[PDB]
Every structure is written in structure tokens, then in C-alpha cells.
Design a protein around this motif. Structure first.
Motif, PDB file in Angstrom:
ATOM      1  N   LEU A  33       0.859  -1.174   0.000  1.00 54.52           N
ATOM      2  CA  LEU A  33       0.000   0.000   0.000  1.00 54.52           C
ATOM      3  C   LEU A  33       0.896   1.226   0.000  1.00 54.52           C
ATOM      4  O   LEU A  33       1.807   1.340   0.829  1.00 54.52           O
ATOM      5  N   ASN A  34       0.640   2.136  -0.936  1.00 51.83           N
ATOM      6  CA  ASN A  34       1.426   3.360  -1.030  1.00 51.83           C
ATOM      7  C   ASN A  34       0.510   4.566  -0.775  1.00 51.83           C
ATOM      8  O   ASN A  34      -0.699   4.498  -1.037  1.00 51.83           O
ATOM      9  N   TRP A  35       1.089   5.665  -0.290  1.00 50.16           N
ATOM     10  CA  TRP A  35       0.360   6.905  -0.095  1.00 50.16           C
ATOM     11  C   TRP A  35       1.038   7.977  -0.910  1.00 50.16           C
ATOM     12  O   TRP A  35       2.272   8.136  -0.814  1.00 50.16           O
ATOM     13  N   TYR A  36       0.223   8.753  -1.655  1.00 54.95           N
ATOM     14  CA  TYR A  36       0.671   9.889  -2.447  1.00 54.95           C
ATOM     15  C   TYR A  36       0.038  11.174  -1.898  1.00 54.95           C
ATOM     16  O   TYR A  36      -1.090  11.147  -1.413  1.00 54.95           O
ATOM     17  N   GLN A  37       0.764  12.281  -2.002  1.00 49.84           N
ATOM     18  CA  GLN A  37       0.277  13.604  -1.613  1.00 49.84           C
ATOM     19  C   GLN A  37       0.133  14.432  -2.902  1.00 49.84           C
ATOM     20  O   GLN A  37       1.089  14.521  -3.667  1.00 49.84           O
TER      21      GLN A  37
END
Ligand SMILES: Nc1nc2c(ncn2[C@@H]2O[C@H](COP(=O)(O)OP(=O)(O)O)[C@@H](O)[C@H]2O)c(=O)[nH]1
Ligand SMILES: [Mg+2]
Lengths: 213, 222, 11, 169
Positions: A33-37
Motif C-alpha cells: 500500500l502506497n500513499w501519495y500527496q
């Protein structure tokens, strides 16, 4: 497909507050799982990968946690520059899927807008149209009322508003209201006024000009 | 070091084919990584379109598969997207990005994005008018000025001030679509009232779909 | 350290 | 539903990850992270029996994990994979088998010898020598191509059948 559900869709928090946003996968994705801003007008930027690994260069106030189907991104001390929409993305398998995003905005003290009115230029007016602009600068909260009065007569149906995204430094908004009149209507009236109502103003503020003065 | 940059027409007619290219620099597509396309309709989320390897192996979003063609050119170090039979639902900012491995990886970096609008309407360059600083500007206080950028199509326009030297206090508003089918926006800046008589303020407006480049000096009205 | 290698790291 | 625990072993680059992904997800993959050792699950029908396959796609690991330890203890069958164009990978096979025997403390561990990349007409490994190495071990030899899919189901299904043969004995 693996559906990713983010919550909440949006939130407001003060500078220094701890912020937690959640991502839920429809089936287990282990730690993939990755998080982008994403900031306004920019591409998404990787913050966290593999559920908890911080991308180099990213401030330490950002952290990620979770595994299986439940994940969280946490900002331990929200800063004005953190205004963005955050997206999770599962990397376990195809098709690659993203959550719907969470928009994070800063809650700050009330700031009344500085109001400015602009007449149409002579060049535009000569071409047949008069655009009259009212500017509400650097205010908070976003809610504002802007009325156009021509010789004290309330206008309706001939104005359009635009609002900027929250400022990354002072957490304010700016707004423009544009009144569109024909050259004939503009030239047969004298006083052009914009009347502004806002939480930071004890009574409405009016900015005006007299055509030809 | 690794940079990605999208290019291609910003306007496509309904039923026709959208074509974009991503120029890669700082890394060779032939060395490795997967090279993807992701899009974002205005005000909405991200949707992965597809990814390709230097070998030609392609992976697709199943809802778009029948319309998508992704290709690579290892000699030119670019990769491309073709999306056929476009509709207004394909109006979006299109991004290219890379990921190291097929799965269990992440996208980094991404291109800047390129807006593609699906419409039957023709391009049209803007008119630029001054938003002159008021004669009643507070002495020793703060004045505001700007430019009104009117009647253009499609989005976007870029506005800079004094060639990009003036950025503090600038607010370029999101465009509004008018009844005529043309966009309009204003770009403003707050400056010291004491600078009005001496400092030059010019807005530099660029509208790439029409090759319109306009410089407008904004000064107090005589 | 169960070998031959084989898979590394089996103890 | 009957659960079968399988383990895929072999030198780096022989196609363990490609075979596993082709079996489970029906994709041929050019570049899957060579360092990832992960477990996969697939429900398949084999000889009319509903099977739940738990597959460990092994890789080079610096630490001995809890996940690997589960397969060390309860893994029932092994696919020993080499590539038909890499002699060194075929030479490693006897070491993989010797180690599996010690790990399970048994001379009779269900195993299949897999010669992958058979879509390439260029063969550095003599497939007759592979069939004779498998005969010497008393196990099946299966040729596969993760690229064309030829033999992929055959390799894993034959291993399930070897496990059944072992359980009934
Ligand atoms: N031509 C061909 N290439 C294959 C085959 N199986 C795997 N490969 C390729 O061999 C390389 C190594 O594969 P990989 O699955 O990572 O091997 P692992 O290290 O054993 O997991 C990759 O580039 C694969 O696409 C096959 O059957 N045929
Ligand atoms: Mg592998």
C-alpha cells in the motif's frame, strides 16, 4: 478488482494537530500500500510505500501503518504546507487501484478579506462589453457573500465567482466575483459597488467606483 | 535526475483518438522499470490506465482496455498513449509515471501532467485587459492590481508577473466557463501602494493551444 | 544453517 | 476443499516468480522484484477435486522469516526449478534436493523437477540428462514455459498428485 475506500473524504484540522486518514482494501494486500500527496496543479508525490516506509526527503511528521485490509496515514503535527489531497494505492496486483482521496485543509483564525473593486478597461468597454471585478483577498473561513449593486440596484444572473485553493503558507482563500454588462448598460449607470459579507466583518463592507471619475 | 514530461494536443474531438507522448530523461526505458499512464478528470480522483515494459508487454485497466494502445520507443527514450473513440468522460489531466517492478512497487517520479479536453469546439486565444490599481489606494498601505484573461478555449492559460520575478501575493483564479463556451479568469497581485508610480507590473499570459503570447503592462489609469 | 545451498538462510 | 502447501525453489532468474504469477493470475511477467519471497493462494480444480493451493514463491533472503518457517514445517511438496538455458541452475538442483531432504528429515518428500523457459529453442541443458536426473530421484520431470503457459498447470498439478500419492501411502 481490489477496491480501495478512503475515509474521511475531507477534514479540517488546526496547525499542530494530529491527523489520521484511513484506507481500507476490499481484500488483503499484505503491506503493498502506497500513499501519495497531491497539491493543487501538481502531480501526486510519493510519501509512503510498502504501508510504512517513509520516502527519503519526506518530513518525519508523516507515518504510515497497517497491513492486510486496514491502513492509516498519520501527520503528527499538521503544517500549513500539508494542505493537499492524499491518495492510497494498492500495489499487490492488477489492475492497479487508488482510493478516492482525502482532502486535508487547515483550520485557522478568522481573517476578514481585503476588498478591491476594478472598473472595466476602456479598450474592453469600447469592444461592447464591461467586465467589473471584485476581489476578496486572503480571508478565512471560505464562506463569503458578495452582492453587486449598480446605482444601488441589486444585480442577479450576470455575475460569476471563482475561489482559489487554500494558500500553503497562510491557510487563507481569495475570491473573485465578475459582473458582466453590455457597454450600453454600463454607460447608462454611475455607481458600481460590491458589497461583502463575511464572519470577520462586523457589518458589510462596500467598495465602489463612479464611472468616469 | 530522472524526469518525465508529457506532450501532445490539449484538444481532441469526440469519437476521435487522443495521442500523448512521455519523454523520459535521466534513465533509459530499455534498462528496466514499468512505464505507466494515470489520469485525473477535473475535480476527481486518479485512474490507472495502463503500463508497459521495454519488451512491449502491456497491462491494462479492464474498463479501458478495448480503447487503449500503449507503445515504447527505446531509441528516442519515449513512451506513448493512444485512447480511441474519446467522449467527454475522457477529459482529464493525463500523467506518465514509472515503477521499478511489475507489482509490489510504487510510482516515482511522475510527469507534470497534461490536460486534454474532449470537445467539438475550436481553439481561440484570449484577450487580456488590465485590472488597474485604484486611484484611492491607501497611501503607505497595500494596493491590488491584475489582469483579466478573457474568452479563450480550451484550458489552460498560464499567467506569470514580471517574467516570473513577482510571485509573492499573486493569485491566479481558476477559470470560469462562460455562456459563449469560452473561459475567463483573472490573475491579481497585492503590492505596496508606494510602488505604483515607479515599479513596472506586467502580466505575461501564455495560451499554448492558440500560440498566443501576450504581455500587458498594468499601470494606474490617467 | 541446514545445507547444501540450496536455499540460503535455513536454520 | 483440500489444502495443499507447495514451495517453489531454484536459482535466481530461473522463473519461479513468473511460473507462480502465470499459474495464479494468468500474466507473463518480465520483471518481478527478485528479492521478494511471498505466499500466494489459488482455488483450482484438479481431477475433479477442489484444491486450495498455498504456494511459497521463494527468493534469496537475508533473514529466516516466520512465513518461511511455516512452509519449512508444513510444506508438503517442492517444485525444483532450473532454466533450460542456464547450466549453473541445473547444477544447483542436486543441492536443492539434498537440502529439502534434510529440512524434512525424509528420503521421500513429494517433488517435481521443472525445466523452465522451454519456449526458447536455445537449450544449454540437455533435457535427456534432466529426465535421467528425475528418474534417478524417482520423481516426475516437467517442461514449462511461463511465457507461453505450456506445462505451467502440468508442473503444479503433477506436484499435487505426488502429494496425494504420498498421503495415501
Ligand atoms: N522466455 C522466457 N523467459 C522467462 C520464463 N520464465 C521466466 N522468464 C524470465 O526470466 C527472468 C527471471 O524470471 P523470475 O520470475 O524473476 O525468476 P526468479 O528469480 O526465479 O523468481 C524474467 O525476465 C522473466 O520474464 C519463460 O518461461 N520463458
Ligand atoms: Mg522471484
Amino acid at each position: 478488482d481490489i477496491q480501495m475506500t478512503q475515509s474521511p473524504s475531507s477534514l479540517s484540522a488546526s496547525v499542530g494537530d494530529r491527523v489520521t486518514i484511513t484506507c481500507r482494501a476490499s481484500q488483503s494486500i499484505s503491506s503493498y500500500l502506497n500513499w501519495y500527496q497531491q497539491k493543487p496543479g501538481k502531480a501526486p508525490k510519493l510519501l509512503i510505500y510498502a504501508a510504512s516506509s517513509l520516502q527519503s526527503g519526506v518530513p518525519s511528521r508523516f507515518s504510515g501503518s497497517g497491513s492486510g485490509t486496514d491502513f492509516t496515514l498519520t501527520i503528527s503535527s499538521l503544517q500549513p504546507e500539508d494542505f493537499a489531497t492524499y491518495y492510497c494505492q494498492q500495489s499487490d496486483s492488477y489492475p492497479l487501484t487508488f482510493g478516492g482521496g482525502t482532502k486535508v485543509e487547515i483550520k485557522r483564525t478568522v481573517a476578514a478579506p481585503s476588498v478591491f473593486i476594478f472598473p472595466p478597461s476602456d479598450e474592453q468597454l469600447k469592444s461592447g462589453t464591461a467586465s467589473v471585478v471584485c476581489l476578496l483577498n486572503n480571508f478565512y473561513p471560505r464562506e463569503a457573500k458578495v452582492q453587486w449593486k449598480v446605482d444601488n440596484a441589486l444585480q442577479s444572473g450576470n455575475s460569476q465567482e471563482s475561489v482559489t485553493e487554500q494558500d500553503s503558507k497562510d491557510s487563507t482563500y481569495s475570491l473573485s466575483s465578475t459582473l458582466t454588462l453590455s457597454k450600453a448598460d454600463y454607460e447608462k449607470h454611475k455607481v458600481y459597488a460590491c458589497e461583502v459579507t463575511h464572519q470577520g466583518l462586523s457589518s458589510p463592507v462596500t467598495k465602489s467606483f463612479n464611472r468616469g471619475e | 535526475q530522472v524526469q518525465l514530461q508529457e506532450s501532445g494536443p490539449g484538444l481532441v474531438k469526440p469519437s476521435e483518438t487522443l495521442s500523448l507522448t512521455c519523454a523520459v530523461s535521466g534513465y533509459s526505458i530499455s534498462s528496466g522499470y514499468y512505464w505507466g499512464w494515470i489520469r485525473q478528470p477535473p475535480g476527481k480522483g486518479l485512474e490507472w490506465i495502463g503500463s508497459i515494459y521495454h519488451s512491449g508487454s502491456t497491462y491494462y485497466n479492464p474498463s479501458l482496455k478495448s480503447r487503449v494502445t500503449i507503445s515504447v520507443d527505446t531509441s528516442k527514450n519515449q513512451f506513448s498513449l493512444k485512447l480511441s473513440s474519446v467522449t467527454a468522460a475522457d477529459t482529464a489531466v493525463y500523467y506518465c509515471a514509472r515503477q521499478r517492478y511489475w507489482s509490489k512497487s510504487y510510482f516515482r517520479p511522475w510527469g507534470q501532467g497534461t490536460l486534454v479536453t474532449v470537445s467539438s469546439a475550436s481553439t481561440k486565444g484570449p484577450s487580456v485587459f488590465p485590472l488597474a490599481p485604484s486611484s484611492k489606494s491607501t497611501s503607505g498601505g497595500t494596493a491590488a492590481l491584475g489582469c483579466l484573461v478573457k474568452d479563450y478555449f480550451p484550458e489552460p492559460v498560464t499567467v506569470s508577473w514580471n517574467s516570473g520575478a513577482l510571485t509573492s501575493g499573486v493569485h491566479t483564479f481558476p477559470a470560469v466557463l462562460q455562456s459563449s463556451g469560452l473561459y475567463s479568469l483573472s490573475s491579481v497581485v497585492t503590492v505596496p501602494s508606494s510602488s505604483l508610480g515607479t515599479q513596472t507590473y506586467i502580466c505575461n499570459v501564455n495560451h499554448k493551444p492558440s500560440n498566443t503570447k501576450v504581455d500587458k503592462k498594468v499601470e494606474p489609469k490617467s | 544453517l541446514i545445507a547444501x545451498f540450496g536455499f540460503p538462510x535455513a536454520x | 476443499s483440500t489444502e495443499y502447501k507447495l514451495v517453489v525453489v531454484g536459482a535466481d532468474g530461473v522463473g519461479k516468480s513468473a511460473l507462480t504469477i502465470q499459474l495464479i493470475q494468468n500474466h507473463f511477467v518480465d520483471e518481478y522484484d527478485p528479492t521478494i519471497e511471498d505466499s500466494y493462494r489459488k482455488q483450482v480444480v484438479i481431477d475433479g477435486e477442489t484444491c486450495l493451493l498455498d504456494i511459497l514463491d521463494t527468493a534469496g533472503q537475508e533473514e529466516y522469516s516466520a512465513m518461511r518457517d511455516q512452509y519449512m514445517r508444513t510444506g508438503e511438496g517442492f517444485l525444483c526449478v532450473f532454466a533450460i538455458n542456464n547450466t549453473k541452475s541445473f547444477e544447483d538442483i542436486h543441492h536443492y534436493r539434498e537440502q529439502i531432504k534434510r529440512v524434512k528429515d525424509s528420503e521421500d518428500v513429494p517433488m517435481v523437477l521443472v525445466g523452465n523457459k522451454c519456449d526458447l529453442p536455445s537449450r544449454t541443458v540437455d533435457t535427456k540428462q534432466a529426465q535421467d536426473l528425475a528418474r534417478s530421484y524417482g520423481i516426475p520431470f516437467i517442461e514449462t514455459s511461463a511465457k507461453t503457459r505450456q506445462g505451467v498447470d502440468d508442473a503444479f498439478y503433477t506436484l499435487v498428485r505426488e502429494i496425494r500419492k504420498h498421503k495415501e501411502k
